[PDB]
Amino acid sequence: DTEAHVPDVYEEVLGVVPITTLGPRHYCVILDPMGPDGKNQLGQKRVVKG
Amino acid sequence: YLPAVFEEVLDLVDAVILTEKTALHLRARQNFKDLRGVAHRTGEEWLVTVQ
Secondary structure, X not given: XXXXXXXXXXXXXXXXXXOOOOOOXXXXXXXXXXXXXXXXXXXXXXXXXX | OOOOOOOOOOOOOOOOOOOOXXXXXXXXXXXXXXXXXXXXXXXXEEEEOOO
């Protein structure tokens, strides 16, 4: 979207998140991931690999 | 908003933050009709969400 984003007056910077990368032999269990609605499906956990 | 001759200005109330993760649980202090057009009694507690 924007490689250099200026913190807007309407935005507070909570932090910067490093990319979580899964190797060819790796999986992670994402606690509380969104569905397609963009809303946090808490409690759930989605295993992501590959 | 330029205050009138009678309006004593109180604190600036900001809109609460409502994402689908959260819902605002509030109690009506008295009979009125909300912005959505729903009659509420003098203490009925309901939820306002992103919907």
